[PDB]
Amino acid sequence: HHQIFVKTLTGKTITLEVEPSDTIENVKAKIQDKEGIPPDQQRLIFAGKQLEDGRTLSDYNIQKESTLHLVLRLRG
Ligand SMILES: [Mg+2]
C-alpha cells in the first residue's frame, strides 16, 4: 500500500491509503467516506484522463504520492 493525494479545485487535499490493484470504483468509495460525495457524482482526473471505475491505479500508472484531481459531475 501507499498514499495518494486527491485534490479539489478549492485547494483541498484528501490523502488516501491505497494499493496498486485498487480500482477507481474502490477509490471513489473511500472519497465518499471522507467527504460524503456520492461516487456517481465524482470525476477523477489523472494524466488528463477521466478515470474509469473498472480500471486500477496501476492501470493508470498512479504511484506513491501521485495526485488525482477531483471535481463534481456537471449537471444542469
Ligand atoms: Mg483496500
Side-chain angles (χ1 to χ4, degrees), residues 1-11 13-49 51-60 62-64 66-72 74-76:
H1 62 278
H2 58 83
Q3 292 190 327
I4 59 172
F5 306 114
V6 177
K7 175 196 172 289
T8 73
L9 284 177
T10 61
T13 300
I14 300 164
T15 303
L16 299 180
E17 296 278 21
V18 300
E19 291 154 32
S21 55
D22 285 345
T23 63
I24 294 302
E25 179 184 33
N26 186 261
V27 177
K28 292 183 168 173
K30 283 201 165 103
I31 293 164
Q32 179 177 216
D33 300 334
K34 297 200 78 89
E35 298 291 350
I37 304 168
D40 66 302
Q41 298 308 306
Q42 299 178 32
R43 303 190 56 246
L44 289 168
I45 297 169
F46 184 80
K49 299 170 194 304
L51 304 185
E52 297 174 17
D53 295 338
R55 296 249 294 175
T56 67
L57 298 178
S58 65
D59 285 337
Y60 286 116
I62 293 159
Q63 303 216 122
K64 172 184 188 73
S66 288
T67 300
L68 288 48
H69 299 288
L70 172 65
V71 298
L72 293 170
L74 181 56
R75 311 170 283 116

